[PDB]
Design a protein around this nucleic acid. Structure first.
Ligand SMILES: [K+]
Ligand SMILES: [K+]
Ligand SMILES: [K+]
Ligand SMILES: [K+]
Ligand SMILES: [Mg+2]
Ligand SMILES: [Mg+2]
Ligand SMILES: [Mg+2]
Ligand SMILES: [Mg+2]
Ligand SMILES: [Mg+2]
Ligand SMILES: [Mg+2]
Ligand SMILES: [Mg+2]
Ligand SMILES: [Mg+2]
Ligand SMILES: [Mg+2]
Ligand SMILES: [Mg+2]
Ligand SMILES: [Mg+2]
Ligand SMILES: [Mg+2]
Ligand SMILES: [Mg+2]
Ligand SMILES: [Mg+2]
Ligand SMILES: [Mg+2]
Ligand SMILES: [Mg+2]
Ligand SMILES: [Mg+2]
Ligand SMILES: [Mg+2]
Ligand SMILES: [Mg+2]
Ligand SMILES: [Mg+2]
Ligand SMILES: [Mg+2]
Ligand SMILES: [Zn+2]
Lengths: 53, 122, 122, 112, 206
RNA sequence: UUGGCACCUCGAUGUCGGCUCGUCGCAUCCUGGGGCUGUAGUCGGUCCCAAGGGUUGGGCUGUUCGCCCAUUAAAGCGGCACGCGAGCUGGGUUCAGAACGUCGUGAGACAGUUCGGUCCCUAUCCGUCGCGGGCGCAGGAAAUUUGAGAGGAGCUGUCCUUAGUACGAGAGGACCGGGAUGGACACACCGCUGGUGUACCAGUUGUUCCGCCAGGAGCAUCGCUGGGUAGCUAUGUGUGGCAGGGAUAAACGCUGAAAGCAUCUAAGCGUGAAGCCCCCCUCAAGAUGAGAUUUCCCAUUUCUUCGGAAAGUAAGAUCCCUGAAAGAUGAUCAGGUAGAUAGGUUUGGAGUGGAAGUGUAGCGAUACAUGGAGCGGACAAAUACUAAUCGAUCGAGGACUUAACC
């Protein structure tokens, strides 16, 4: 319930291989050639599926 | 679903009236008994002048139960009380008359004098 | 079904609120779980509107909040969400069978990273 | 399920009548030995009718000799030779489980 | 020896000529086809590869399409081998109906049990709860890992985890009814898996 | 076990008994096999082989032990810090209080008693149980698989018959074998019996509200109460340990010498256990020994002086999205307009139990009809109405030698 030993730099880093976060699943609006999230409304043009909002 | 410390009204003429179970028979960890299954018992309530009396250990047969039975034809018989019959070492009663209804599982398990003396077997 | 961090009272209150709000404003920004429930709720109200029976109206009035959309000088008379539901909203979809409501994904909220959506009735 | 229904449709007994809880029935039930049969009558009141199709059951309650008995049957057994509805009963519940904590004069079901 | 693949449709009950009542699982076994016939010289073991359901060519792929085209039929969803089976039967492309069985014929039913998630020990492994009163703060915990001396705990000390999904065979079940029109097989009792699950029915080893 | 020694630990190695979980040995309690019997049979005594599985529930006590009741096929002996307190209890005991008897002038004490009395810790590492990501497995992919190896299970009674036969003066009463039905245990599943069912139905109390009546809503444990879908599940249902091969233990023997006989052994043959290896269930090619079969994509372009590289693709797979049969998250599985994946809608269905409004009867409460009505989370089938849009990303161009084919 208490550490018997201090985690070394290497073992710390070997845990931290997976804490990362991923590039977001985005792409360019067909209307504005400007990056946006798939299946989401573009915040720049305010448009979705060829239809303003 | 009769197990240790379960009580049962007594359905026969013998001096017993109410009964407590000591031991479900038929194996090591047999913990519940159903209709047609013998159970070692004590008498906790007796009628005066009876053959059987307060404090006597005796073997006895389960004859009607709230948790009853299912038959191979898909049908279930249930009662509103758990009742027993006190018997000898053979499968015969010690009393002479039998009260209340009764189940055919006894007829299956060769408790035939009980099946006979009872008024309505269901 | 979806629980929403809330016990049954609070959840039902939330849905009554959100559904009334979508009937009133016809477009609201919420979270996608709340939205994915009020689609069911609201569209089941639109059916009651499409029926128009008194029984459907009472059944809906048991759910919708009693609050005003606007006032109309006929003398100033207020209109209510139930009136807007049966007299304005649901006649719009007399010919549409189902699917009276869509959800458009907007993006994540700052203070809690919550995934937010616009829900509107077409 | 529809497929289940389509299979079990043949074993549906149409000889069974319309009956409900509250009503008194007489069940002409078969009781079978290794090579023999008796028909025995169970006349009592219907408490519940649950299920669907051939998975449907009803329970009939009786009081025999100061003891209450409660006998369940599938609706579509061939070991019910006949089912005679006698008294129909006005009653406000589908499940008449209250009759178990009741003996006579309170178990009385009003006929119509 | 003889076998099919099927889907579990559900459970019901059936009355037999005696008037006895018999629960039954329903298996719908349509579109069964023989796709490959494995040999001792080509592979090292004799078996018959059956494919069960027809599916769509956009859910399929070109490899599966080729393997089924070598049988002259459509892509399939479930494909499985059966062993201890004669190969002089089962010509490629052949359809494999429920009529291979018969009432009272006796089988093993093999399927993938239902999914309970992460579970504890008393549900999963059947252990006993500790008391819920008399001062207990030990209710549904697993018990001692073991003794002190090893400085370690032995394998097969049973612990929480993901309960189901395991493959299961139930043995010596009875076939009640056969309906070739519905492609339906009835089995006394049960089989593993939820509804819509794959069941592998075959003649019993014993 | 009682003890002896005082070698680790006094900068802490927590004690008896119980609960949870077990695991190991065999000096085997039961089941199994066998020899001797002062073994007639039934039952038994003693001894050899066997550790496969099994080996109860209560009363008194803090109790282990032990006595008792009642069962059992049997109620094994022991080791693991007399297993297990960062897993639980905390009754006893030796913390502080108080009292009894007793010893002491006394303070006070007693393996004398009695009543009462605080058991801390967010798991770093290994280990254990489950789930993923990465790479490898001399091209890249999709499915099906062998099975080294590994785990699991392995128990057993009672009744019938053989046959009231054998045996016995009778009393009694079999072996071997054939079959039926149970206990405990395991696995699975929810059609049945039931339970639960806090977004299903109803009744109902108080009070506030919806302007009032009426109908309804809020709070009161989901207000209480009667039911109950799916799902989860046992106490419920289905099945299981069947039948067995191969080689052995103890043992019984055949043949046969050494040792003209004898001898089960020395060479050599046979029988022979619940045990050993298999049969049965499950996992399993990271089985770096990285296996096999079937099918699919092809041999691109830039470069680089070589090695070798990157940079767009194919088969295929995914980011993303709708989701459940799945699920801690991932994963898995079902689908993504070449669409019924989910929601809604329409039909139904379980379930509840006879909506509202209106009318009739009644002073009224209320009752009746309209009308198995109305409502109906998760259930089923159809329906593309709503949202799964449009995109984007990863993903090969297949080294060398030998042999045979050629
Ligand atoms: K010390
Ligand atoms: K410990
Ligand atoms: K749908
Ligand atoms: K009405
Ligand atoms: Mg509340
Ligand atoms: Mg227990
Ligand atoms: Mg607690
Ligand atoms: Mg230290
Ligand atoms: Mg320490
Ligand atoms: Mg020995
Ligand atoms: Mg005590
Ligand atoms: Mg005790
Ligand atoms: Mg200890
Ligand atoms: Mg302790
Ligand atoms: Mg410790
Ligand atoms: Mg204490
Ligand atoms: Mg003391
Ligand atoms: Mg004390
Ligand atoms: Mg912890
Ligand atoms: Mg850790
Ligand atoms: Mg169920
Ligand atoms: Mg109120
Ligand atoms: Mg009112
Ligand atoms: Mg208040
Ligand atoms: Mg042998
Ligand atoms: Zn844009």
């Amino acid at each position: 319930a208490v550490p018997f030993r201090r985690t070394s730099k290497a073992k710390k880093r070997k845990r931290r291989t997976h804490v990362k976060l991923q590039l977001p699943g985005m792409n360019e609006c067909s209307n504005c050639g400007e990056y946006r999230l798939s299946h989401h409304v573009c915040p720049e043009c305010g448009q979705y599926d060829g239809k303003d909002v | 679903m009769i197990q240790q410390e379960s009580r049962m009204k007594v359905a026969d003429n013998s001096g017993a009236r109410e009964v407590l179970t000591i031991k479900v028979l038929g194996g090591s960890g047999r913990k519940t008994a159903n209709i047609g299954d013998v159970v070692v018992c004590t008498v906790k309530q007796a009628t005066p002048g009876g053959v059987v009396k307060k404090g006597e250990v005796v073997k006895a047969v389960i004859v009607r139960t709230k948790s009853g039975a299912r038959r191979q034809d898909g049908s279930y018989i249930k009662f509103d009380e758990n009742a027993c019959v006190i018997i000898r070492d053979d499968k015969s009663p010690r009393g002479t008359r039998i009260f209340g209804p009764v189940a055919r599982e006894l007829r299956e398990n060769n408790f035939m004098k009980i099946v006979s003396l009872a008024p309505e077997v269901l | 079904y979806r629980k929403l961090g809330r016990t049954s009272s609070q959840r039902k209150a939330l849905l009554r609120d959100l559904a009334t709000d979508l009937i009133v404003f016809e477009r609201i920004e919420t979270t996608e779980a709340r939205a994915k429930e009020i689609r069911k709720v609201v569209e089941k109200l639109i059916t009651s509107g499409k029926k128009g029976d008194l029984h459907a109206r009472r059944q809906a009035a048991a759910f919708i909040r009693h609050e005003v959309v606007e006032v109309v000088q006929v003398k100033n008379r207020p209109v209510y969400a139930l009136q807007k539901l049966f007299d304005d909203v649901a006649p719009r979809y007399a010919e549409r069978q189902g699917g009276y409501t869509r959800i458009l994904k907007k993006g994540p909220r700052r203070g809690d990273g919550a995934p937010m959506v616009i829900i509107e009735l077409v | 399920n529809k497929l289940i229904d389509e299979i079990t449709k043949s074993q549906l007994n149409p000889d069974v009548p319309n009956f409900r809880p509250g009503d008194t029935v007489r069940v002409h039930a078969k009781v079978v030995e290794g090579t023999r049969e008796r028909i025995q009558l169970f006349e009592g009141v219907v408490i519940k009718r649950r299920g669907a199709g051939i998975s449907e059951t009803f329970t009939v309650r009786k009081i025999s000799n100061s003891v209450g008995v409660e006998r369940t049957f599938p609706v579509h057994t061939p070991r019910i030779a006949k089912l005679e509805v006698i008294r129909r009963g006005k009653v406000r519940r589908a499940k008449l489980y209250y009759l178990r904590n009741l003996r006579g004069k309170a178990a009385r079901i009003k006929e119509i | 020896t003889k076998g099919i693949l099927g889907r579990k449709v559900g459970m019901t009950q059936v009355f037999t000529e005696n008037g006895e009542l018999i629960p039954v699982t329903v298996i719908e076994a349509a579109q069964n086809v023989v796709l490959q016939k494995k040999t001792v010289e080509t592979d090292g073991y004799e078996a018959v590869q059956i494919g069960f359901e027809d599916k769509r060519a956009i859910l399929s792929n070109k490899p599966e399409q080729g393997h089924v085209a070598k049988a002259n039929t459509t892509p399939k969803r479930f494909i499985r081998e059966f062993r201890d089976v004669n190969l002089d039967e089962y010509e490629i492309g052949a359809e494999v109906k429920v009529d291979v069985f018969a009432e009272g014929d006796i089988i093993d039913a093999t399927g993938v049990s239902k999914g309970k998630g992460f579970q504890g020990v008393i549900k999963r492994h059947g252990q006993s709860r500790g008391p819920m009163a008399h001062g207990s703060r030990y209710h549904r915990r697993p018990g001692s890992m073991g003794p002190v001396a090893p400085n370690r705990v032995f394998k097969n000390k049973l612990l929480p985890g993901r309960m189901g999904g395991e493959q299961i065979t139930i043995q010596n079940l009875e076939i009640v009814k056969v309906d070739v029109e519905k492609n339906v097989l009835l089995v006394k009792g049960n089989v593993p898996g939820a509804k819509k699950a794959l069941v592998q029915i075959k003649t019993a080893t014993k």
